[PDB]
Amino acid sequence: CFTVENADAVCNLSDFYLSFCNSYTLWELFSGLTCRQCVEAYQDYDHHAQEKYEEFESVLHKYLQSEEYSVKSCPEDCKIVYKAWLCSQYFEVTQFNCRKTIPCKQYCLEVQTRCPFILPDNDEVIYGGLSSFICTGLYETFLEPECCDVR
Amino acid sequence: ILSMVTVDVIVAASNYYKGENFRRQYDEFYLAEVAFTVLFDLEALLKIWCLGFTGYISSSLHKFELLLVIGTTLHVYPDLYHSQFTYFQVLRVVRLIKISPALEDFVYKIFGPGKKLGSLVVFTASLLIVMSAISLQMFCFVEELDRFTTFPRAFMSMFQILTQEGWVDVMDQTLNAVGHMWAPVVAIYFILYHLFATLILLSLFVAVILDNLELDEDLKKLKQLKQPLRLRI
Amino acid sequence: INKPWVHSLLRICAIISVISVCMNTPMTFEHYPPLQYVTFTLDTLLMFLYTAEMIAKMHWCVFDGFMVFCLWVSLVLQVFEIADIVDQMSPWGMLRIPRPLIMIRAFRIYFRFELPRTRITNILKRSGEQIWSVSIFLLFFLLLYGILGVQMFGTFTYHCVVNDTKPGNVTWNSLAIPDTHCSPELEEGYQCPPGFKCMDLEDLGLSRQELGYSGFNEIGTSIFTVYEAASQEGWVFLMYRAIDSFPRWRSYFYFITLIFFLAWLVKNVFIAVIIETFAEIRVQFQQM
Amino acid sequence: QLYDLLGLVTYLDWVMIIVTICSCISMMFESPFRRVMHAPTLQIAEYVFVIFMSIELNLKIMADGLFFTPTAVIRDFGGVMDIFIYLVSLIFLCWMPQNVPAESGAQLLMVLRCLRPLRIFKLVPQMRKVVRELFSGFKEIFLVSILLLTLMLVFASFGVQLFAGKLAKCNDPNIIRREDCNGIFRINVSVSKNLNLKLRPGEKKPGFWVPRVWANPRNFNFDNVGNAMLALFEVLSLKGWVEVRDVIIHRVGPIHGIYIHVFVFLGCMIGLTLFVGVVIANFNENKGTAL
Amino acid sequence: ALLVLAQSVLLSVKWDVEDPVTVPLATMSVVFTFIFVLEVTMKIIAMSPAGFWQSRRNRYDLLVTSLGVVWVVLHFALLNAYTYMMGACVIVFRFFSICGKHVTLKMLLLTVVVSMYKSFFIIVGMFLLLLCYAFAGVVLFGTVKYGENINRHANFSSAGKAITVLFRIVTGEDWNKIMHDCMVQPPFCTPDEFTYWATDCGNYAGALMYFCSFYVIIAYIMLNLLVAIIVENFSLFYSTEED
């Protein structure tokens, strides 16, 4: 319950949450994925995730049909799942101190389950109605690490 | 032979996509196609032996079948497999038209004398070619415009205008390419071409087919002058 | 000229000329430099052949004279542009605009009529008069719908944008996703949700070209848009813009009647005309 | 003319027409959040219609008979349709479930219930006349449909044989190889199709980050014969066919651009004109001026 | 006829109070009316009032002129949006009145009106079929997640939206994209086990059958009845010189 603020102060590791990706703790990432350079890299990854999340939030805010596109989904869940998905992708590590957990991969599916249909630009490639956010390719067997169900 | 062609077409169409992992130039489908081509060659040889070359060629359907046989014999060449010649592989299904005499009679009646429709199609092709060339020579040099940078693209654009799909988008892009001083004349030219294509040419097709369905006037006059229920149980 | 073989060679030469004019293109030479010379050879060689006829015709011909003159002009322009003194991207290519028309010569044999040309001329004249009448009908309806659009639908230029957008800073990032119109009225049209507000991008300084030509700002543009909609191409999007930008009933009535009248019946008038022409061909000729 | 109009059908028939109009108007207000099963206000029309339909059937069956009579209530397709509609409505009334799982028997029952307006066709003689005139040319329409089906089968077989699995491209244009497009990339978002604004040099188009995937286009593909047939049927309408043309040309080479074009010539320009000619010829035949 | 055409062209700019250009135009619209009044007065003072009344075209012209005179009287008193819209409507009707003046255009107009009158029953049949399909569509797809083409405009959430979308499909614009939007299945959409109104997933086979049948039946068959009606009526009425 101590969000990492100073790179030097930090260095049980199981109680120091990250700034942006608060769902994860430094201990697991150390386990699966000198300490000053590591913590600095962690902060850089968090900064990049913050930037991309802000970009996505700005894009979504302009979607005027935000509360009508689905009767079973709301924008807050879409934002939460996007944040978790990005954090998991930068932090491809199994979480151990979860209380309830699911594979991290399915998180992207849930995105396209709850997030609105964003139409991609067709200027140099004809997408033919292809959704911006999809996971499974042509005849690709989708299903690994497990991590907290932050839903 | 009808059942055999039906089975051949069904097998050919059954070559659905399975996976990128396994796929080879030689497969059960290729062997089946070679076998069917051999059968067609045997049939053609027997037919020519019996009826003679002159008798065999004397009728249009036999010429068509011979042409298909040659096409599918070239098709099975391993370097030419799955090439354009695959068209000749599917054209075999045309033979099935002979299963029902009613279908053949309907085809002959509705298409009528081939001269009219042949003239119409050649006229359409010639008009499309000339207009595509004209617009190419008008627009090929225009910078920032790719729709007319080559003759094939100009023909694609004109065919699109004929179909009426996205025609307004092509017109808008052309007006964007040219300066505002020249936009009006090019817009007028495109509008006139679209008007001519949509209102007359398609109407010409409709009228041609309608007249094909229409009976001959002499036959009309001749025929006109000449001229147990559910409870049965 | 005497032998029919000469006519056959002339027809094949006309086909080759059409192919050559189709091939001549700056990017064709750029991607395939060698063909730049090939097009030259035919362009001159074929010309020479036709010159003979011009020499032999001294003892309708204005058509052949104009075509051969166009051939001369095209060869001359080719000579200058191969010397590299005139840019290949120059507009001078327009001088080849009438050359492909030579294609008609290929069918001239079929165009020749020895039967009583008077009747065919009468049929074509009657068809021309009927086509003219239906054209006036269409133009009158288009003008009517154009003036109605000018009066009813104003101009489609109001759009929702981010609250803090400033003039001259208009850009992709300033528009809502998807771009949605308004009516400034508090009760009519669409209202920007909170945090956005809509106004005229024309006032911000955007040019007409970048906003698109479609609209009802003037009678000319109004009839242009009416014809575009009457083609059944993009009329639904225009209708949606109208609903978002103006009262719902106005757009529904206008577009429903426009589709009812112009799209179906008026178009069918032309098919009716051609059917009557085919009937007259059926009787007048008595055989075909 | 008013007297003739009022005498077009029997008084019972007029009452039935009015009742059907009331019922369809009442059904027009049904919505997923205003279901009839839970809205008593909409029940009245259904109840009145069913009661009146029941009495009509009761009166007619004892007057004409259901079978083996010179005149019967059910002797043509109209009687079959009316009996079917009444039985569906009565079953709906008797059951009227409170929970309707998606794609279940109850949903099918509601779909059948939706066929209610067709009664006007049988009840009004002019609608019967126009239906008969339309169906007169059923054989010719069927033959034309078989011809189009054969052409579509030819082209679908060719497409499945040649293009199977070749239309798939990774969603990221930058990468060219399947194995090399993994992770995340930045995809732009459509703003306005009609707009053609220029972009300032120091700005990036709106967009967000999405994963790289090797996926086929959603609207069409040629993986199997069924998908090819569906794609060709879509191309018959002349809507969205330019996207198919561009996709084929860019992803399978420009030569295969012939394949689509010829189809549009054979299927769209001619094929539908066969339907047009058949319908016009049948109309003239029925009018009686064909000979 | 030329004066009527000029008055119609006067409507080239939207009449609105804010724009000053509106005020002059109205003025030039007044004088024409007075001139037109003479054309009526003449025709009603050259002929007996009954004689003028017998011709229906004269009745229409008199009604239009009276309405225009009323608009002139109102304009000098109120000078509001109502007056401008009334004047625009009067000018529109006067321009539409040109049809009787010409011969060929008149005959074509009679063809069109007779065609719609005789196709009334076919149009009612189309409307009934469209209503049936609208009921089916609202039942099957009343709650579908918004997609490529389903949006605020294209929706099946109510009967009216279904009618509008079906009419669009009859016009054919992007029907296939709507169908594929209705094709959405998991994991794109959230399925429900109990009720269809609590789920956003579409019906695959239902969508295929629905849209294919609707498009084929309406577009390929029924409109050709209107085509035939137009053809027969145009042959009936339109007729140039006969040898």
Ligand SMILES: CC(C)CCC[C@@H](C)[C@H]1CC[C@H]2[C@@H]3CC=C4C[C@@H](OC(=O)CCC(=O)O)CC[C@]4(C)[C@H]3CC[C@]12C
């Ligand atoms: C017999 C009649 C009725 C039909 C006439 C058809 C010709 C006008 C067509 C047939 C083949 C066409 C050619 C086919 C292929 C090409 C390749 C094409 O190559 C490129 O465009 C490459 C450009 C690049 O990629 O940079 C240039 C046009 C050209 C010569 C085409 C020009 C027009 C041709 C000769």
Ligand SMILES: CC(C)CCC[C@@H](C)[C@H]1CC[C@H]2[C@@H]3CC=C4C[C@@H](OC(=O)CCC(=O)O)CC[C@]4(C)[C@H]3CC[C@]12C
């Ligand atoms: C074919 C028949 C049925 C009639 C169709 C009308 C066309 C004959 C003409 C008449 C009005 C014309 C339009 C009148 C006005 C304009 C505005 C013009 O835009 C500008 O004036 C901006 C100039 C600039 O920004 O520099 C572009 C051409 C356009 C669309 C013209 C295109 C051709 C139109 C539609």
Ligand SMILES: CC(C)CCC[C@@H](C)[C@H]1CC[C@H]2[C@@H]3CC=C4C[C@@H](OC(=O)CCC(=O)O)CC[C@]4(C)[C@H]3CC[C@]12C
């Ligand atoms: C006299 C002639 C015209 C015969 C017409 C008979 C129809 C009225 C039949 C044919 C199809 C039948 C339906 C077929 C299937 C079902 C599914 C069935 O669904 C279930 O509830 C069972 C499964 C479950 O409950 O989980 C209920 C009856 C119903 C609506 C049937 C009701 C009666 C229908 C509409």
Ligand SMILES: *[C@@H]1O[C@H](CO)[C@@H](O)[C@H](O)[C@H]1NC(C)=O
């Ligand atoms: C997004 O737009 C930029 C130009 O602003 C372009 O370079 C980029 O390729 C586009 N995105 C994709 C996925 O092509």
